[PDB]
Design an enzyme around this catalytic site. Structure first.
Site: not given
Lengths: 255, 254, 255, 254
Positions: B26-27, B99
């Protein structure tokens, strides 16, 4: 369904190539046994540089020197086996492999290494130069022989492989004579470094050393290193010129 | 002036792909920050999946769900960092990185917001596409960043619907009967000792250090739980976690 | 020597992929004669989808359905020959080719086209979906059969190729029934368009028409078009439903 | 959920590369303008070769000569435009594009400044690298933009050292004896008629229109002269130009 977007954004700085190592091999078989082995067998390589004066090279239909691509560069050829270099392992993953046709041989108890043909070497220089310009992270120290990455399970490309010649063509790592001499000076004055410093030096250069180094291992380490950088004598013995060449290479090519 | 011969001979059997792993991240940042950080920053990823309900995103020109390529698959994106899985390491060399925009937070304690439904569908499509072109990308090889950098990372976190992807044919999951069978056994035989447990984690794929802390062991369990028992990822040893692990190893002996 | 710089700048908007067309073929040979032909012969294809109930498919060692890659997508397979579509020619250059094992046959004077197996079709949908998501410029009209791009020298993938099924899987171009009916309405009221408008319409859709269209050519044009979009009857005759389907496709998929 | 089989069978003989052409351009703009126009603009190129004596360049961070990749070779850069060579067209599909920074000017009349020595060396290295990996990229297939878009383009112009590249094993050039032999013949036999001349240009590779103007014919000669007789590219028919063409066709009958 979604079509992938390859245009709206592109990474610039924080990325690279997968490949960063270039490995040199001898086939220890004639041409015909080599292609067969490297295409349908248990091992492959990205490139196969044949020796033009090979009776089965002519028997297969070929005439002059050429370069064969067996596996695409973006794909994984099986040429390195269990290997290490510059703190990486499983080098098949991150390397391009060049196989050279050469009747090197064989462990009759005794190792015997014949010359390479000249057209072969001119091919190899052209080829590796082509590759290096296209992979920014294959810096000089990362052009290696199978024996550097597999001490001392393998003995290719062998002491007939003209490394210094390749270096002068801009392919691979070599020291400066002035620098070598200074380390030599040098060790002849205050003595060879402790085996600890040496092991450290060899690791530092790229060699994948075990946690504890056997006397027999250390022999094979020197041998491999000499077959590459001090080929006039590769008996596996620690002299001062060997240590000097190591230290000079590390100075020229540090972190 | 030789030209290379790409036609005379072609390896068939003894060769493969350089890529065999798929890593999900995840970003922890909105769209505008993500695309900037993954294109000009310190890290990158092969693909980015935006969250459509994001002002950064809409402001950038977009509306519907889409999938962005940032680095060609054949190249090396900078996403795994120090990492290890399946007896390999430096997973950037041999993986593809995905991502997903999701605003996960580490204050002192972690908040993990749900993923949008459209993101999951996109992810499912992207992973199937990739899985079909990489033969050695077997189900255990679709991993979270937290599987490969244990204790260092907590993505994609407990909101990532792993079972859902497994049903789409993406990634490893256990058989319910097999888990119950193992939990039954552990319940009446007792749990294995740490030593055997660790071996089991290695076996599945985790890159274990030379020695393990109580602290590392906890974060190992926490990582494994986030992926395979998300309903409780406190990192404590219970029979379910062990059963799920043993269940996984039996189904996927690779 | 210079190392190429792949990081300092990257093109974002003004570029694309080389490939934008996806072409479907039948092999008209059994599996064994197909691989041999497409690997060592005078023609190749990027993919070969075998029919699992093929005695030599089993004879070669295979069991269930699979998909074979023969040439890498980035390379040029020889499958299209002399071809045209959407104002491009030499389609081998810009296309990926899928070969399907199918005993279509043969010009005994008479063309006879057998069904495709179901596992084959499920493979083909999976495959083409995989491809389309990765090539942004292969829009619906650009998924074509060899017969669309080579009117009427070729007759594959054939009228057994379930195009509408593929469309519902998001693979390829199909019209809307409401729209077809309206054009049909339509032509039954004020008549079929002049042959000029029709030729123009066919060009517009993608067909590479000659400078002047023979009666025999026009037959082959209709036939090919019907084998793809109106397979219930492909006798090569201009009816109103044919013209309607054409016009509807153009409306749905214009420039 | 099939996986693709890349190992069982591999085509050897009947296949090739999608690329067989190499096209040289000049930017007509400084470095800063070029990189901007070729990365975010209306056109692009696979490679850019900067001119080191350029304030844009030095200002951007650079000093020595280098070679920039902007589009991966396998992708389609937007550089040829409407074009044709060797019975093909739309050369963007099947070519690789090289842009060289050079401040060529079309006021009403053309000024073509020399290329820096370092640029030529870089170009020579880049072309050899490419020529070795594309077997059907034969010597006639290294062309200038002005060879493929006749009358539309004047790059890389008369300062591009074609003979020099030919000596490096890059691109077509004639044998001196063969040219003199043809000029001797034309001098005592007269030049061929336009019709035969045009056929000869087609033969070499030029994509000729259905009919030719005096105007087009001029610009055809001007194009061919810029490449192969740069000492005079006024576009007028003389025996040398024709001799050089015929000399080329004999050496390279492809």
């Amino acid at each position: 369904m979604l079509t992938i977007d390859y245009n709206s954004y592109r990474t610039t700085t924080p990325y690279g190539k997968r490949v960063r190592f270039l490995v040199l091999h001898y086939t220890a078989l004639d041409f015909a046994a080599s292609v067969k082995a490297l295409t349908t067998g248990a091992a492959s390589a990205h490139y196969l540089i044949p020796a033009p004066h090979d009776p089965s090279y002519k028997a297969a239909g070929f005439k002059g020197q050429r370069i064969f691509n067996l596996v695409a560069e973006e794909d994984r050829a099986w040429h390195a086996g269990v290997s290490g270099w510059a703190r990486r392992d499983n080098l098949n993953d991150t390397s391009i492999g060049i196989e050279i046709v050469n009747l090197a041989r064989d462990d009759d108890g005794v190792f015997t290494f014949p010359d390479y043909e000249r057209s072969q070497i001119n091919a190899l220089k052209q080829l590796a130069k082509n590759i290096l310009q296209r992979y920014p992270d294959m810096t000089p120290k990362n052009v290696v022989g199978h024996s550097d990455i597999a001490v001392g399970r393998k003995s290719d490309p062998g002491p007939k492989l003209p490394w210094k010649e390749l270096y002068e063509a801009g392919i691979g790592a070599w020291y400066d004579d002035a620098t070598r001499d200074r380390y030599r000076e040098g060790f002849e004055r205050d003595g060879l470094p402790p085996r600890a410093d040496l092991l450290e030096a060899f690791r530092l250069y790229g060699y994948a050393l075990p946690a504890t180094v056997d006397d027999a291992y250390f022999a094979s380490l020197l041998r491999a290193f000499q077959m590459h950088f001090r080929p006039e004598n590769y008996d596996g013995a620690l002299d001062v010129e060997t240590a000097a060449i190591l230290y000079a290479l590390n100075e020229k090519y540090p972190a």
